């Protein structure tokens, strides 16, 4: 009830740092972003013991609800990090993008990247031949402040790119296609 009430009012971030079973597995479904730790965190309702007892299927803990499954195939986890220390370091960086509440404007931070510079690298990215793919990320990185881009679900639904970046100090969200 609180997680639903807070939706659209305050950001809700849930980082999974270990196994999660039963009803607990639904709270990340109500928050805004879910992150995991590779080979350490799990998300499932029932364990492999129930799957084997109910149906004639063979599965292990990692296959059923491991971080790799949820960041690559089911689309449940927004990103997995290698270990606990790196996971929290990236979480601090992610935090700095978001406002404290929905009543606040997108945060604006000190920026040294001139807002009026040109990016000549863009003129030749897009081929004239219609059947030749190009990497959309090259455009995104060249436009955003200081070439910093935070990519969400890098391994899931690769044909569309979404993520956070700053332009002239202000946090923006970026959505685009990946022709590759």
């Amino acid at each position: 009830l609180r997680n639903v009430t807070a939706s659209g009012v305050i950001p809700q971030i849930s980082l999974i740092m270990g196994p999660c079973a039963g009803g607990a597995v639904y709270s990340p479904a109500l928050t805004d972003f879910t992150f995991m730790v590779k080979d350490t965190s799990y998300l499932f309702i029932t364990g492999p013991d129930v799957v084997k007892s109910v149906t004639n299927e063979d599965v292990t803990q990692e296959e059923l609800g491991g971080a790799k499954t949820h960041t690559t195939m089911s689309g449940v986890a927004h990103r997995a990090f290698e270990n606990d220390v790196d996971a929290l370091c990236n979480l601090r960086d992610f935090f700095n993008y978001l406002p404290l509440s929905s009543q606040d404007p997108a945060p604006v931070r000190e920026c040294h990247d001139p807002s009026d510079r040109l990016v000549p690298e863009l003129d030749t990215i897009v081929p004239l031949e219609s059947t030749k793919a190009y990497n959309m990320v090259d455009i995104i990185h060249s436009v955003v402040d200081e070439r910093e881009f935070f990519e969400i679900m890098p391994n899931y639904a690769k044909n569309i790119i979404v993520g956070f970046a700053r332009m002239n100090g202000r946090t923006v969200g970026i959505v685009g296609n990946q022709p590759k």
């Binding site: 080979d39 270990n83 606990d84 220390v85 790196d86 370091c89 990236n90 601090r92 960086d93 700095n96 404290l100 509440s101 009543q103 606040d104 945060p107 604006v108 931070r109 000190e110 920026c111 040294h112 990247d113 001139p114 000549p120 690298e121 863009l122 003129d123 030749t124 990215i125 219609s130 059947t131 030749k132 793919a133 090259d138 990185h141 060249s142 402040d145 200081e146 022709p179 590759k180």
Partner: protein, 668 residues
């Protein structure tokens, strides 16, 4: 006065050089390009351009028939091919002259005259240069090997009458090992390729490669310019050259310059070209070869002679005499040139890389620096062409000023998107043997006997690198806290007086404590006190810092939240992982899991039909090299290699249909 319109039959910086000179002269310049070079710099700089053909050069820059069509289509009067492609192609010059188009370069007589080694040696004998005699006969006896050497000279080489690759070769100096070398080769060589006839000739020790340039005149005149020292090379291609050698005094320069002219005036070489000499440790100069074409080492002599070689070649081709006399040619200072390639210097000294350029900034704000480049940001470098990026030329009043300015230009020279060879150039020019001049044509092979490893840091340099990396780390941490104030939710900046860091380099972990005093960070690195002062503009590709009075330029190439930073320091990229004290103390509890690097296994990223495979087993593969193309959904998905090597097996062929995850090619 001069030509109204000149066509250039080349691409890249050499085409740019001609376009700039023509514009200075008021001459319209026509460019040619392939379909992939349509957006290259020389195409945009030229006044008119004609597309000739597709990406491979054999159909675009060596297609003389398509070029002839472009020459007449634009009503060009003269053609300047630069170097490389059709500069020595006689059939091109013949069919070009047949149409009364002025060719800028050698005529076909000079090209054929030096066509082979026999005519070149005969010219050196007639022009009277050197070409040291050998033995015009077969050595048969045990005493002939030494008796003949006694009549001609001292350093004597024994080699097979025909063959190579060590086919009984030995180097001898005195008579005892000359006799021994012959009899060994004459009795064992018969067991290799069935031939035991030995010849003797004369050799030199630690050679230096020295060029002298000559400017020919159609009226019979010819002048010689200052020499070039071209000893730093890999895979028989030069990378660094110096103009005002060091191995010559005033008399030697005149003596050798006159001989280079004697060659040019005896074949009537009314063009610009180069004569190559080898000099031994005793300052004995021997003829090596005569070249007919503007060399790639012509932008370093110009900085001390004050000439413009392209301007002069165009007037000579029009029919004007040389504008100078020999008494006016002198050394006005010193100039050194470095060639920058898109190559990995670690992989057997220069393995080509493939890629696109995302950041590019030439050091043109520094004194005494001239950058001659054919690329612009958003340029691609590919397997079809020699991976040249630029030629960096630095000049000064003395040898130390030109070298110091070169060192500065290399650290302020931004190339990102490809792998480059700046680390190699930055270390060679500062090598104690290079500064003193003890350089031979095999210099790099003795300095780096196990390959290129990168710049090696000493104690003080490690302390400066640690202090810079630690201060830059904190500078980002402080910038992260400066928000516009939100009147609803006050933000309180943490009062962090000291930053306690654990800074891991290669295999060592250092203890660093930093504090901020405004623009300067006071950093203690394992007990050593350093003060790093800067403006700390964190967006610029070039960050200028002063560490205890020492001026450094560094580049931060990448940053991660986990503390990983990639910092280029003195040309070499160092990997440093900066954790806070707390993160480093707890990180020891993490399991050191290691995964497999399966970069040799190239699988299809997308289902569809295979339309091209660029390889067969044994083919060389560069990083980023296209291997396979799979087409579906009206799109061609190019699959590239992530590993340098050769192909071991090609599993899917063109015409085959593959799914997602199927194996296409397997590398060694």
């Amino acid at each position: 006065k001069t030509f109204d319109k000149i066509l250039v039959a080349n691409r890249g910086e050499i085409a740019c050089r001609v376009i700039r000179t023509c514009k200075k002269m008021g001459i319209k310049t026509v460019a040619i390009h392939s379909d992939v070079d349509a957006s290259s710099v020389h195409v945009k700089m030229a006044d008119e351009a004609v597309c000739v053909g597709p990406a491979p050069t054999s159909k675009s820059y060596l297609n003389m028939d398509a070029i002839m069509e472009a020459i007449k289509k634009t009503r060009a009067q003269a053609v300047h091919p630069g170097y490389g492609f059709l500069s020595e192609n006689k059939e091109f010059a013949r069919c070009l002259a047949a149409e009364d188009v002025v060719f800028i370069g050698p005529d076909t007589h000079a090209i054929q005259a030096m066509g082979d080694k026999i005519e070149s040696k005969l010219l050196a004998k007639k022009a009277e240069v050197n070409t040291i005699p050998g033995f015009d006969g077969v050595v048969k006896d045990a005493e002939e090997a030494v008796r003949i050497a006694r009549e001609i000279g001292y350093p004597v080489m024994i080699k097979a009458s025909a063959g190579g690759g060590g086919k009984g070769m030995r180097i001898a100096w005195d008579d005892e090992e000359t006799r021994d070398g012959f009899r060994l080769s004459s009795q064992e060589a018969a067991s290799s390729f069935g031939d035991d006839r030995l010849l003797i000739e004369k050799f030199i020790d630690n050679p230096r490669h020295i060029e002298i340039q000559v400017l020919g005149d159609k009226h019979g005149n010819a002048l010689w310019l200052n020499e070039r020292e071209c000893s730093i090379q890999r895979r028989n291609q030069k990378v660094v050259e110096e103009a005002p050698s060091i191995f010559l005094d005033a008399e030697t320069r005149r003596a050798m310059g006159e001989q280079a002219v004697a060659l040019a005036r005896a074949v009537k070489y009314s063009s610009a070209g180069t004569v190559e000499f080898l000099v031994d440790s005793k300052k004995n100069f021997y003829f090596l070869e005569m070249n007919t074409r503007l060399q790639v080492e012509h932008p370093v002599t110009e900085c001390i002679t004050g000439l413009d070689l392209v301007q002069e070649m165009i007037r000579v081709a029009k029919g004007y005499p040389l504008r100078h006399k020999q008494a006016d040619i002198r050394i006005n200072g010193w100039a050194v040139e470095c060639r920058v390639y898109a190559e990995d210097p670690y992989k057997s000294f220069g393995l080509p890389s493939i890629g696109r350029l995302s950041q590019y900034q030439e050091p043109l704000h520094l004194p005494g620096v001239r950058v001659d480049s054919g690329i612009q940001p958003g340029s691609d470098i590919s397997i079809y062409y020699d991976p040249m990026i630029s030629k960096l030329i630095t000049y000064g009043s003395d040898r130390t000023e030109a070298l110091k300015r070169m060192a500065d230009a290399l650290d302020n020279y931004v190339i990102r998107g490809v792998t480059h060879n700046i680390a190699l150039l930055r270390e060679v020019i500062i090598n104690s043997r290079f500064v003193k001049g003890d350089i031979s044509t095999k210099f790099l092979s003795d300095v780096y006997p196990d390959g290129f490893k990168g710049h090696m840091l000493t104690k003080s340099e490690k302390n400066q690198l640690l202090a810079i990396a630690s201060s830059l780390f904190v500078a980002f941490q402080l910038r992260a806290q400066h928000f516009q104030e939100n009147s609803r939710m006050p933000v309180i900046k943490p009062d962090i007086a000291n930053w306690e860091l654990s800074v891991k380099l290669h295999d060592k972990v250092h203890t660093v404590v930093a504090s901020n005093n405004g623009s300067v960070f006071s950093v203690e690195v394992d007990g050593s006190k350093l003060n790093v002062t800067s403006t700390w503009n964190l967006a610029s590709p070039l960050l200028s810092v002063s560490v205890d009075g020492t001026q450094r330029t560094v580049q931060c190439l990448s940053r991660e939240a986990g503390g990983n930073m990639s910092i280029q320091f003195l040309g070499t990229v160092y990997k440093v992982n900066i954790l806070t004290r707390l993160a480093a103390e707890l990180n020891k509890f993490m399991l050191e899991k290691v995964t497999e690097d399966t970069s040799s296994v190239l699988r299809s990223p997308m289902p569809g039909v295979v339309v091209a495979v660029s390889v067969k087993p044994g083919d060389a593969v560069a990083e980023g090299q296209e291997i396979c193309v799979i087409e579906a959904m009206k799109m061609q998905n190019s699959m590239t290699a992530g590993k340098t090597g050769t192909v071991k097996s090609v599993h899917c062929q063109a015409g085959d249909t593959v799914g997602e995850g199927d194996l296409l090619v397997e590398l060694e």
